[PDB]
Amino acid sequence: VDMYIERAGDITWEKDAEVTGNSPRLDVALDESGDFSLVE
């Protein structure tokens, strides 16, 4: 399998950008395999 990279852009902050999405506060756990899960 050929895994390769290709440039996609410069890393720059955009002035006057679209502000979207909420800001949830969640209780989560992280297992040794790198998986997050919600604490119920």
Place this chain on the structure above:
Amino acid sequence: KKKX
């Protein structure tokens, strides 16, 4: 979602 890695969680489309």
Place this chain on the structure above:
Amino acid sequence: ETTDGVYRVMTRRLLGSTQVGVGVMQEGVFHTMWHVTKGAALRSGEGRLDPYWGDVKQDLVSYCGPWKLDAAWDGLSEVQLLAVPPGERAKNIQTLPGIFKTKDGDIGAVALDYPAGTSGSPILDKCGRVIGLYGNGVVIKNGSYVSAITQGKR
């Protein structure tokens, strides 16, 4: 072959290509999420980049050298996801992070939903520094997604 910037991580077989993720080149080191490459070597032009460090629990891997990204979310300010979705140009999305509260401290987290191959897209502070990578997260009850701001140790 290691110029600074954001990059797509692609795979090709006999047919076309598929974008499996994204990563950041900084200080001659390529940074992405472990689940994107599983530490496989990466072709960059005519060259080969080899895995240097990684951690499955953090879901991170670096190529060519140690993890270089050390900027941290300030816990207060809005950030930008520099999303690089498959088949779409890079775009900046500004958001105020929420929080993953864990037994081992809090982690900023962004409630933005993109295809699997967007994994590894960088999250930026107002100075343009990479405060972490997008794409290791949880699905909440309504089906939407929340990604940790995953940052390594330099």
